[PDB]
Amino acid sequence: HGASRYKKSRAKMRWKWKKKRTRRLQKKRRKMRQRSR
Amino acid sequence: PGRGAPLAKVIFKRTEKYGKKEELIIASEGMFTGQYISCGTKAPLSVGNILPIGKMPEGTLICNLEHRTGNRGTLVKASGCYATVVGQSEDGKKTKVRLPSGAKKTIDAKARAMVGVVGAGGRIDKPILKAGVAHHKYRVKRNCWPKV
Amino acid sequence: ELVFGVAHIFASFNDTFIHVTDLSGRETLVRITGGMKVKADRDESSPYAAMMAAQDVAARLKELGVTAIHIKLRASGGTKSKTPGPGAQSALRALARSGLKIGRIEDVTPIPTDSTRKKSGRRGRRL
Amino acid sequence: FTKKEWYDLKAPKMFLVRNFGKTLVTKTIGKKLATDSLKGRIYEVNLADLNNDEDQAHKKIKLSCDHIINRDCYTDFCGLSITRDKLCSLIRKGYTLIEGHTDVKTLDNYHLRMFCIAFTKKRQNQTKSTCYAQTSQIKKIRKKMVDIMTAEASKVLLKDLVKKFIPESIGKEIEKQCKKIYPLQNVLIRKVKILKRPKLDISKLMELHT
Amino acid sequence: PKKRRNGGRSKHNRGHVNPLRCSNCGRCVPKDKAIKRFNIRNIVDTSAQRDIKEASVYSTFQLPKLYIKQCYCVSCAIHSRFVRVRSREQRRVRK
Amino acid sequence: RMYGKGKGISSSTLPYKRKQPSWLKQKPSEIEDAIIKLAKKGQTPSQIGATLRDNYGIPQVKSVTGNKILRILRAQGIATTIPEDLYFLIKKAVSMRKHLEKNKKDKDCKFRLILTESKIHRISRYYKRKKLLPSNWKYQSSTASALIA
Amino acid sequence: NPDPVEESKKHKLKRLIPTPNSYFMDVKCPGCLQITTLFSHAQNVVLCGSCNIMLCQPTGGKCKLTEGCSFRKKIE
Amino acid sequence: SAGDNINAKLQLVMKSGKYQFGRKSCLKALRTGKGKLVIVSSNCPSIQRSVIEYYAMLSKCGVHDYHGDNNDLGTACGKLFRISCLVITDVGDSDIIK
Amino acid sequence: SRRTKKVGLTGKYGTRYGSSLRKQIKKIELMQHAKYLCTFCGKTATKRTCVGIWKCKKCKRKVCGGAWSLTTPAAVAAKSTIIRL
RNA sequence: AAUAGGAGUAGCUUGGGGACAUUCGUAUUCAGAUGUCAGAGGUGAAAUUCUUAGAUUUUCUGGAGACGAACAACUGCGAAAGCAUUUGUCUAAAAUACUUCCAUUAAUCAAGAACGAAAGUUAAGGGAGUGAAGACGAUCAGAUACCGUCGUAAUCUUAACCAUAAACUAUGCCGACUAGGUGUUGGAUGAAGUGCUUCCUUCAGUACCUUAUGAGAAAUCAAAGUCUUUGGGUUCUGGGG
């Protein structure tokens, strides 16, 4: 999205949930970086 | 070094005779050389004084308790440690105190204890640096180590 | 002449207890809940049950020889609710009907005088 | 159940009826002698029903069992509360609630804790709805209220202090001084508690009971 | 857009107003935001009051009042039919 | 207001007349003598001016004499090197710092101490920009009390 | 229009033309028997010049003066 | 208030009084009988305080207790070293007595 | 000082022992090697000479104290309490 | 000597401003008693759950952690975050007042710094209730959820840290000018209820209501006005998804 958070109009899934998925994903990626390095 | 805290050399003058007599007391925190220490039934309430537990007001902090009168400070001797007076009997004779384990116990009021907390507190807070430091500790303690 | 007891009426909303005692509390006289009188083993709070319990208490007090009661109302724990239970009015009315003599009546419902935390999440119960 | 037996509840010389009822107590057995059961227990006494003025029904006093002979218990004073219904009623919005307290000893060595409430007066000059006092004033009133109360408690014996409580003489004295700081309204002693009521001097207790 | 000028509450010149907990659903809610009803109520109505009075001692005596202070949340107040939703303009018309 | 959210404008407002009171009997020498006595006794110019108006009944020194009191204090050689305002601010900051040394958990005192120190630096920078304050001189956090006593 | 206005003086210290509210008073006290200049909004206790006893009581709103005494207002 | 009031007096004594600080000079001044007022911190040695008080009493000189530290009395007099006790040998603009 | 980035006074330990332990040691050692203000002469020379004992060099005098600092919060509170009563 | 700024002084100015000590109340909970006899808890409706070794219920002692209700508000203070028991101590704060002092000190500010809810981290306490996790009973088509019962980690304090929130007056901050009334909190000025109290006038705060041939896309906004009739000063930010 933009830099600005949420803004549920009709929107999609919960922004906090999207954020949870990305925070969990970034950690998973950080584990891939750990596997690499 | 066997004791966790310092000893204090205290001079009294011989009540039954003449001249100066030296005792070895466990040093309370905030004790100092040239401090005056008072001991007895009619002694004033102040830190490091040695008083029957019956004459403490409740919630006071004390150390060097004895399980019976004149047993000479058998309890509450380790560094930084203290007991709390938690109650005084309604018809007297007994007194209720709290051991540094947190346990409560009832002793006679007549039995003595020493106002305040034992010196060298916080000693356990520093971690043991190394095996040589552990060796130096056991060298003055007991034959007990390496502990396989 | 008159002999006075104290009728504790303890209403949990779920049931309405009638527990009458000596004026000291110590040395009780009748326990009858209201739920003891419920014969269907369901739907525990009932004005009817509270009335029957009161009639039993009155019968027992007449059997004993206590001819009058002072009433202490109490609703639940006051953290749980401030509401008096439904059958409380029934219990009171039954005592009035009984012919036992009704002295001082007081509320002793035990609400908190503070604000310490209680049951369910911060959004509350969703029921 | 098993048998129990009525025993009369007496009240001290200060209370007009002197007989506030009968209590049943379980029949005797070996080594536990029911005297023990009668002794020490507590009774919630509504005051009005002893003196026979319905104005005083807003208080209750607590009475403890302290001396028994045969079928008779004499009883002593142990504490005092206002009834909750009256207290809630007295509390009125738009006015200033002050409550004082102190821990105190009575001439004859009875140790108490005393709780005194006070509301600001409505008066004719308040005009608009807000009649709240300033905080500095209520602190001064609170300090003053405690000072009068501790002076009143300390002076006299226990029976006379109890006698002062009944028409609320202390509240009148508090009101007269504190009116100068700001007008007040119902200034009552909400609760009275004993801290240390003497175990010894049963003889004096019996004499006080008379 | 903004439906409520004050946000449905009273938080002016304040960062936080302490939460109370609801008497009904049990939720935490700020005291200004909270729907508070003082609720002076009588224990029983008329036939009951008559019977208890007759059963009672004392010409003087009359039953205690019930002093509650019952707190409702927004969901609770609509749920139990405590309050209406007014009308958009009328949402500023206090009793 | 410099830091405060508020904006009170309570202040002195002189009369339109800027010349001598009609009833005054004193010459500049008398007013100088009164200033000298108060100054010597240890009063500072605000305290002297307030005293002169209240105790002695004589308003504004600029109207009753040809000169202005800090100037007069300097001219007669009594004057402190440190200004009143800087002295009070340093003392106030020292008071906060002393208090903070005793009690470490006072966040408002720390916030005020930084604010007051910021005002000290501003006043110092102004006095240094003026010919008033030595170039070498500077405020320092903890030596200040000893410095200005 | 604001030029001939007379009722402007009620407002805050800074008006259309700013003015002091404060004034001086010629004061004399029983027993002291002395006449002295004194300031409305003075900030300290003031003693008699004849002897030693106090005259004025200071306060924030003007001055509290004395229970006795007479005070003429100073005019230029 | 009180420590501040004393500090103002000490500031006046520093500025325009004549004073002498520390044990040996203070005793000598008392012995001489030049001293006007002795101001002794409670953080002085018991013995040093006692000697000065005895000397002052003999010489008909007042003693005032200072509440603050020996160091604090030094910073009050604008120095970085402890003073402990001083004797005024000429009164300044200070109000040391009524 | 202007040598190490973050290990400071525990840099003598630096190549040995766990980092968190070195953090814990750093806090204790900072207190341990500090020179305390003496109640019995007003100088900041009071040093620890053995575990429970803190000696002033100048007035040559032994104060009993904590293991790593002059006084525990507990002892101060007790002292204060006794004066209070 | 600025209806700018700073500093001072004055008033039994003010207030849930900050810190430290102190102290009270209550429910709750535990342990010790205390009297009862069959159920008590719990819910859309029940069961899991607890109870004849006496539960729930009554009254009393003693302990413990927790919180500060009702009073209490279109109420106060705070830089913001936030702040409500009692008293004391150490502290700060603004307005009012001033024929007190200074003499432009200022305003907004890249860089940098301080403080910064809740959660999280680490260590010591403490660890009652509440209670992420977790466990059962249901509910139900299934339900790992809502609901019920239990319940560790956490919540609390000290000591470090962490530096984000719809951290929202979704309104940068200072400046002037515009329009009224109803209120309201803190002062000062006058007059009349009985020195105090009231009322009148006036300041700095602070909300609301109505009015805007004022504005705006309208909602609405006395600011979001006085901006194509566009320049009072300045910082920051954005350029379809």
From Swiss-Prot, chain D:
Keywords: Cytoplasm, Ribonucleoprotein, Ribosomal protein. One of its GO terms (molecular function) is structural constituent of ribosome. It is found in: Cytoplasm. GO terms for cellular component: cytosol; cytosolic small ribosomal subunit. GO terms for biological process: translation. Its main location: cytoplasm. Belongs to the eukaryotic ribosomal protein eS1 family. Component of the ribosome, a large ribonucleoprotein complex responsible for the synthesis of proteins in the cell. The small ribosomal subunit (SSU) binds messenger RNAs (mRNAs) and translates the encoded message by selecting cognate aminoacyl-transfer RNA (tRNA) molecules. The large subunit (LSU) contains the ribosomal catalytic site termed the peptidyl transferase center (PTC), which catalyzes the formation of peptide bonds, thereby polymerizing the amino acids delivered by tRNAs into a polypeptide chain. Component of the small ribosomal subunit. Mature ribosomes consist of a small (40S) and a large (60S) subunit. The 40S subunit contains about 32 different proteins and 1 molecule of RNA (18S). The 60S subunit contains about 42 different proteins and 3 molecules of RNA (28S, 5.8S and 5S). This is Small ribosomal subunit protein eS1. The gene is RPS3A. The chain holds residues 24 to 233 of 262 of the full protein.
From Swiss-Prot, chain I:
InterPro entries: Ribosomal_eL37/eL43 (IPR011331), Ribosomal_eL43 (IPR002674), Ribosomal_protein_eL43 (IPR050522), Ribosomal_zn-bd (IPR011332). It is found in: Cytoplasm. It holds the Pfam family Ribosomal_L37ae. The keyword Cytoplasm applies. GO terms for biological process: translation. GO terms for molecular function: structural constituent of ribosome; zinc ion binding. This is Large ribosomal subunit protein eL43. Component of the ribosome, a large ribonucleoprotein complex responsible for the synthesis of proteins in the cell. The small ribosomal subunit (SSU) binds messenger RNAs (mRNAs) and translates the encoded message by selecting cognate aminoacyl-transfer RNA (tRNA) molecules. The large subunit (LSU) contains the ribosomal catalytic site termed the peptidyl transferase center (PTC), which catalyzes the formation of peptide bonds, thereby polymerizing the amino acids delivered by tRNAs into a polypeptide chain. SUPFAM superfamilies: Zn-binding ribosomal proteins. The gene is RPL37A. The keyword Zinc applies. NCBIfam families: eL43_euk_arch.
